[PDB]
Design a protein around this nucleic acid. Sequence first.
DNA 1: GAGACCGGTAGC
DNA 2: GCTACCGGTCTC
Length: 69
Amino acid sequence: GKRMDCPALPPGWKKEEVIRKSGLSAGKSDVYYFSPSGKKFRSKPQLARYLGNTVDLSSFDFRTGKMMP
DNA sequence: GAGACCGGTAGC
DNA sequence: GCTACCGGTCTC
């Protein structure tokens, strides 16, 4: 799966949260982003390198997908 | 203490 | 060869 749109980002970006199914950290979740091209990102720096100066992710909270002032 | 970040591998 | 997945440290 369920990639929801992410309005805090430019049009076409989707956010997906995945619950860990096994292991000691089973239950925890990993958050992933998807560019219009379909590229998978898993960290705010990855995302910053790919968008460059189009959007400031300093106030951007990676887990929720919202701009936190 | 919490979680962001990313490395290494198990499973395809 | 690729990649999803969980472990583990680093940063706060």
